[PDB]
Amino acid sequence: IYGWRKRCLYLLVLLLLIILVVNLALTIWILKVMWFSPTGMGHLHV
Amino acid sequence: VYKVGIYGWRKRCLYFFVLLLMILILVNL
């Protein structure tokens, strides 16, 4: 039934949405505690 | 006397997009 077909389709869309949301949260974290710059981590340069 | 219409190629391209975003975001995680 295309009905439950579409239902599970945007259920999968919802799952991809939550994984993207948590990934952006983790990457904003990974940018914050790192003081990240193209020169390198922190105020030094690797 | 045959008349049926449902968008099918749009469904395949939507499944393709869902597949590629799944691949990409699982790789990112």
């Binding site: 039934i1 009905g3 | 449902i6």
Partner: protein
């Protein structure tokens, strides 16, 4: 009615019996515009002419007067859909087709009542209760003879079209025997027992519930694809196999007898006549997975 029957004669494609009778009777009722008539208007019209005795002889004039009483109200409700003289002629034609095989000009009130109540727009159990009250006595009891008369009046209908033998013929005796065997050999039957025996779907009366179902499903729209002619969405009758998976067939290919993947040792089928409920279809899908697991 000659051109109506000529149009009917090209519709001999129905494989089964009850489906054929229901579809043809629905086509007639919509064509006769008697589906616009309700139980209340017909009851008021028949009680207005004092046609209460079931054994009262009926001449042409009394039937004409009652038909005029019905069709005046029908036209007042359906000015753009009902023409009184043509409809009166057509309904007289049909009623005297069913119950005037002798060309004597005399019929019974009970037969006319049964025909109109069956062919009107009302609840199935309401028509059942009214017909039982018509055939039962003042105490509400019905013996073998009144039931036999009612069954005889009912069986006068399929013989007019030519599908009387498929439902046990014109012999009402087996039907009365089955009804009174369900009655635990009681001398008389009651309205509740009559309703229960009718819901048991006897051979000689299933045509009327099949008519009610096809009338209901004429406006049904199912979000599904026909597993032969690939028709999506399903409009009308949806048929779902109870053995295989993802097999849904529309009545357009079902009535022709064409079968996909062949039939089985047993090929169970469920017949949705209404848009489905997701809980119920998930439950029956779980049931069919359980069946195929074994």
């Amino acid at each position: 009615m000659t051109e109506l029957y000529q149009s009917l004669a090209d519709l001999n494609n129905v494989r089964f019996s009850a489906y054929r009778t229901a579809m043809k009777l629905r086509r007639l009722q919509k064509a006769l515009c008697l589906d616009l008539l309700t139980l209340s208007a017909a009851c008021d019209a028949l009680d207005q002419h004092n046609l209460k005795q079931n054994d009262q002889p009926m001449d042409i004039l009394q039937i004409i007067n009652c038909l005029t009483t019905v069709y005046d109200r029908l036209e007042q409700e359906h000015n753009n859909l009902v023409n009184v003289p043509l409809c009166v002629d057509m309904c007289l034609n049909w009623l005297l087709n069913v119950y005037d095989t002798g060309r004597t000009g005399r019929i019974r009130v009970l037969s006319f009542k049964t025909g109109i109540i069956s062919l009107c727009k009302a609840h199935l159990e309401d028509k059942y209760r009214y017909l039982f009250k018509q055939v039962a006595s003042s105490t509400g009891f019905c013996d073998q003879r009144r039931l036999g008369l009612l069954l005889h009046d009912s069986i006068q209908i399929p013989r007019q079209l030519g599908e009387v033998a498929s439902f046990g013929g014109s012999n009402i005796e087996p039907s009365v025997r089955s009804c009174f065997q369900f009655a635990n050999n009681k001398p008389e039957i009651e309205a509740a027992l009559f309703l229960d025996w009718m819901r048991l779907e006897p051979q000689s009366m299933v045509w009327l519930p099949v008519l009610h179902r096809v009338a209901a499903a004429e406006t049904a729209k199912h979000q599904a694809k026909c597993n032969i002619c690939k028709e999506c969405p399903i409009i009308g009758f949806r048929y779902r196999s109870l053995k295989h998976f993802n097999y849904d067939i529309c009545q357009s290919c079902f009535f022709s007898g064409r079968v996909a993947k062949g039939h089985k040792m047993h090929y169970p089928m469920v017949e949705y006549c209404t848009p489905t409920t997701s809980g119920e279809d998930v439950r029956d899908f779980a049931k069919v997975l359980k069946n195929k697991f074994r």
